[PDB]
Write an enzyme that holds these catalytic residues in place. Structure first.
Site, short mmCIF file in Angstrom:
data_model
loop_
_atom_site.label_atom_id
_atom_site.label_comp_id
_atom_site.label_asym_id
_atom_site.label_seq_id
_atom_site.Cartn_x
_atom_site.Cartn_y
_atom_site.Cartn_z
N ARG A 55 0.82 -1.18 0.00
CA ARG A 55 0.00 0.00 0.00
C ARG A 55 0.88 1.26 0.00
NH1 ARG A 55 -2.82 2.47 5.22
NH2 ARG A 55 -4.61 3.48 4.18
N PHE A 60 1.75 10.66 1.09
CA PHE A 60 1.40 10.20 2.39
C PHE A 60 2.42 9.21 2.95
CE2 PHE A 60 -1.72 7.67 5.05
CZ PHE A 60 -1.46 8.42 6.15
N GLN A 63 3.65 1.69 2.75
CA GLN A 63 3.46 0.62 3.76
C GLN A 63 3.74 -0.79 3.31
OE1 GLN A 63 -0.43 0.89 5.68
NE2 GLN A 63 -0.42 -1.25 6.39
N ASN A 102 -0.95 -0.34 12.22
CA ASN A 102 -1.59 -1.15 13.21
C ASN A 102 -3.06 -1.26 12.86
OD1 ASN A 102 -3.07 1.07 14.62
ND2 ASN A 102 -1.05 1.65 15.38
N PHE A 113 5.24 1.68 8.07
CA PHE A 113 5.19 2.61 6.98
C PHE A 113 6.30 3.63 7.03
CE2 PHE A 113 3.11 6.22 9.07
CZ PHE A 113 2.46 5.64 10.12
N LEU A 122 -1.02 11.59 12.93
CA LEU A 122 -0.79 10.20 13.34
C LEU A 122 -0.13 10.14 14.71
CD1 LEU A 122 0.25 8.59 9.89
CD2 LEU A 122 -2.01 8.83 11.02
N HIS A 126 0.31 5.91 16.02
CA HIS A 126 1.31 5.00 15.47
C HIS A 126 2.63 5.26 16.16
CE1 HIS A 126 -1.58 3.70 12.61
NE2 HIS A 126 -1.94 4.97 12.51
#
EC number: 5.2.1.8
Lengths: 165, 135
Positions: A55, A60, A63, A102, A113, A122, A126
């Site tokens: 991903r 951004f 991942q 997660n 990521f 975030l 995370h």
């Protein structure tokens, strides 16, 4: 050194793209650092070698780490079980930050990521545990294979990975 | 978006106060709650005074349906992509851990996740439980 350094050699549909290295902040999050380290060397008999970045969302993050199902639903920690959020001392301050993916509070497995932008929202959800040392231009290249929903346009894989020194 | 009206609500209050928990309550609840968001559904239930034991039966069904919804909808890996909505949990659908705009987004995404219609379905299951107990 207290903080280990890990490398990933990245390949795009089998063709070499380049190497990305990470400093892992074992001096701030030693249990999260050590999971990623050990998964990168393969010392536990399983880990990231051959797995993919499933991903990738441009501007951004990138991942990866689901080396059990390869699609975001799997992954596993060296701890025999998903492990707790160790702390949220380190923040997502810009490109290159390495942080845990997660599925809610205290569900850390193997997924992680690499941020390609500041992702401040975030912070506190995370656990940040490392940063790219060399090869940020490779992560930048990796994002060109991403899409708004994260589906990748080619197979981005970790062709090899290990610990430096 | 319009958060329920004192009138559709005073109506429900009077349906429950007279007709008790006869089967008629269920069709009425469906009409009075057309297009409602979870928060609207909860304000309609919260207005019902007394009938404590029946209300607990309802809650038990809601809690059970929410847990089933969770069971059948694994939590997707975070971090969520910008301009994306997290998927609703059971507690989100029942309106205890979601916001109204969030409820609205879900109802309005393309395609939509109809959180109001889902919670309404759980509610009606619990209403059927009550009706079969009391009548």
């Amino acid at each position: 050194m207290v903080n280990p350094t890990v490398f990933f050699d990245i390949a795009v549909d089998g063709e070499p793209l380049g190497r990305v290295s990470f400093e892992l902040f074992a001096d701030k999050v030693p249990k999260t650092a050590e999971n990623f380290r050990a998964l990168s060397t393969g010392e536990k008999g399983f880990g990231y070698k051959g797995s993919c970045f499933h991903r990738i969302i441009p501007g951004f993050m990138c991942q990866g780490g689901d080396f059990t199902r390869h699609n975001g639903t799997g992954g596993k920690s060296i701890y025999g079980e998903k492990f707790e959020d160790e702390n949220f001392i380190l923040k997502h301050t810009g490109p290159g930050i390495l942080s845990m993916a997660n599925a809610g509070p205290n569900t850390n497995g193997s997924q992680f990521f690499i941020c390609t932008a500041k992702t401040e929202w975030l912070d506190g959800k995370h656990v940040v545990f490392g940063k790219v040392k060399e090869g940020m231009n490779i992560v930048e290249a990796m994002e060109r294979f991403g899409s708004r929903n994260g589906k990748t346009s080619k197979k981005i894989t970790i062709a090899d990975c290990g610990q430096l020194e | 978006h319009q958060a329920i009206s004192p009138r559709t609500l005073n109506a429900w209050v009077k349906v429950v106060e007279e007709k008790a928990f006869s089967p008629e309550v269920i069709p009425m609840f469906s009409a009075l709650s057309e297009g409602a968001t979870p928060q609207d559904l909860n304000t309609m239930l919260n207005t019902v005074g007394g009938h404590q034991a029946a209300m607990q039966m309802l809650k038990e069904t809601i809690n059970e349906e929410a847990a089933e919804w969770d069971r059948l909808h694994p939590v997707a890996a975070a971090p969520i992509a910008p301009g994306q909505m997290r998927e609703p949990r059971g507690s989100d659908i029942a309106g205890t851990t979601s916001t109204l705009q969030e409820q609205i987004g879900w109802m309005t995404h393309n395609p939509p996740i109809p959180v109001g219609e889902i919670y309404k379905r759980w509610i009606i299951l619990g209403l059927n439980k009550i009706v079969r107990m009391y009548s």
